């Protein structure tokens, strides 16, 4: 079912969050997490994924 010829990709996993999740927490925000001192300000640039 979930293995499509051509590439299933409809499924995502949060990769860069700030802190560890609480039990049974559901996080849906998609804000750009800053991977560095320089703030992202949304800009998906360097140190921003």
């Amino acid at each position, epitope marked *: 079912l979930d293995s*499509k010829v051509g590439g299933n990709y409809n499924y995502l996993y949060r990769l860069f969050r700030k802190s560890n999740l609480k039990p049974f927490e559901r996080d849906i925000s*998609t804000e750009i997490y800053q991977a560095g001192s320089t703030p992202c300000n*949304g800009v998906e640039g360097f140190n921003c994924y």
Partner: antibody
Amino acid sequence: EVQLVESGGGLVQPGGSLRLSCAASGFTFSSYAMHWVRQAPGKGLEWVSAIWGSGSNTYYADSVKGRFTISRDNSKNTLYLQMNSLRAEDTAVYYCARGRDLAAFTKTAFDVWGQGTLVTVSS
Amino acid sequence: DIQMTQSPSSLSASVGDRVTITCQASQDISNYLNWYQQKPGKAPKLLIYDASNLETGVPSRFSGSGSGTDFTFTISSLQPEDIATYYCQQHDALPWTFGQGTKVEIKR
């Protein structure tokens, strides 16, 4: 109210370049997936490209693979479409649509469908 | 890719008649198929998503059905503003393809 006001279409010679814009207002732009779909004059619908938020998970239709580049914007919240090496077969009206495939597995469809911009590849 | 042999290419029906437009599939795409209504000079409008769920803000006379590789699609009451061309769009395998489309017009 969701509003996808499109612009940037116009007249281009074959082999040229053109950038389309798709502004968004009334909803969280950074949390939705945006697509581009074109329709040849008097013909059926053909998908073009899709970008699911990230600046690396971009996917294009087989007919435009390599030639078309998709990009988005924060702040003012707009969507862009880079077109390169256009041919006579590329003349179509380009639409930007919505999509919440991210989390929602129900509204997989294109919730809004902008009004579209006309691009003509001719000298 | 996924091919749709949407048939008939065109059919004639009168006001109030029941309309069915078939949309096939390739490999058991379940219910990842959408339906679209398009008027001349107008942008496409969603009609049925996930093959059964009607969109919000749409009159209840529009309904869809089917799953897997066959999709039936059923119109209950024709209205004079319902004249348009309808397209079925697969949304399973890296959604690319649409349907060829069937032109539905009022029999007179």
